[PDB]
Amino acid sequence: GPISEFMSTINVEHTYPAVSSLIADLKSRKVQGPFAVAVETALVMRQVISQTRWSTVDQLIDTVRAVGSTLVKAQPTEFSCGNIIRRILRLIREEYQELLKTADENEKGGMDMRAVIISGIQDVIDELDKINTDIEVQSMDHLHSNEIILTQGCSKTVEAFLRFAAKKRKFSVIVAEGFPNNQKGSHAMAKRLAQAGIDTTVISDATIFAIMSRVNKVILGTHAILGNGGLVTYSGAQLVAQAARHHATPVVVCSGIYKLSPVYPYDLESIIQLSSPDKIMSFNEGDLISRAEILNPYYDYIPPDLVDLFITNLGGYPPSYLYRIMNDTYDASDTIL
Template sequence: MSRLWFSRRDDPDDPDSFARTLKPVLMEAIQDVLDELETVYDNISKSAKDHIHSDEIILTIGKSRTVEAFLKSAAHYRNFTVIVAESGPTYGGHDIAASLSSSGISTFLVPDSSIYALMSRVNKVILGAHTILANGGMYALSGSLLAANAAKAHSTPVVVCAGQFKLTPLWNLYHDYAALDFTDPSSVLGFEEGELVDKVDVISPYYDYVRPELVDVYITNDGDHPPASVYRLVKESYGDEVNDL
């Protein structure tokens, strides 16, 4: 393959040779990604019974398909209780709470404001991730930072379930609100509030930046990894050309 690559690429009489050689390489790479996406939930869920034990109380926030599959897999082997924070203002927690409950898992839906008060009773926090950064931190659904900080205060382990395709070497860490994705502020403060709307700026970020020291372990489709080893996974995924880690 390497000889074919260089010989065709350097052929001045065949300008399309490079494109013809590149096409099967790209198709193979795309197929690898598709295969990973199809199996990511099953591969992550394989270790669920090793991380969740009988009679534990698990807290999660909002809706994550990966976390949902992880908890449902663990329910085949363990009896446990899940507390779902509703994750306002999108309230994705309502959907996952209904799904878990319909699967026979003891589930309680609570407002985000109850997270800290309930944390003393929680054995483990399980979160999903939008993006995992090379420094071991992550972006996750708004409210995840609140849950992670509450867990830190109570020495409660924080477990993050995410596929390795969510690894990224670079991200805008320097934005005031961590992420550039925002929800409609009217869901936080309605326009019917009158004069108050003109006097305040309402910022409703969709994602929180969760620092690496607030995460205990990442469970990926390639095993368990502490935040300190994420940079190695990023290098393996993106190659040696990624130097600014």
């Protein structure tokens, strides 16, 4: 139930201007990445609650349950958005219920909980600018001296994860430039932690199998996690996964929890987007670009039965325990928007 069936575009553009503004920046990739999508999402919803007129909570539920369905229609693949929404919905119904009970002291109006919801929203914001700090701590309970680590594609969360341990313990790391998309960032990361005193070895995205023979652990930072524990990761990460499984090398994932979403991977072909082929073939080979089929996937998928351990802003947990976070973080009704 999108918002267009509840409010008109002009009204949406008038009362909730930043929404349509964000919707524009969403489908146009003006905003991008999971983190930047999340923070901007809540900031929008903050103003929404800060500038809305309503009475019942049930009608307030129907509103946010509508913009999200529209907001998620923009660029659904960046699930980071919808995850923030369903969090708010439960954050309302349980805040309502917890306040529906104090009023039932002995009475046997019902709104303007505004600033609390805002104060509840800000609690989500301040929680995000922190996941790295909350995650980079559990490193010292896994990475040890002289260990050998493999990791692909400039995941910021993974960067501060290792750099923390590298402050005190000294060890080695192999970095595979997540070609083609994560090329630039990956080299920077390698250059960065190189200064952090950790043996860094940049490789082609293809020499994965060659070195997996003598690799202790492998570490990955995803783009999103789906209801079955599957991972929607950036380009070219199933190789290292399958390379690890073939070598009995364990697979660990260091990701914030906001990237977790209960959407179920019915059809992956509707998930893995495709970017421009410019990233892999120049415009110049005019003969080729006219004679062949060029494709450049942005994301990669790995199934959960290949992950051995997750690293979250809450703690380390096996994939089979992931669901019990969702029910403790989301509500079942808000699976489909």
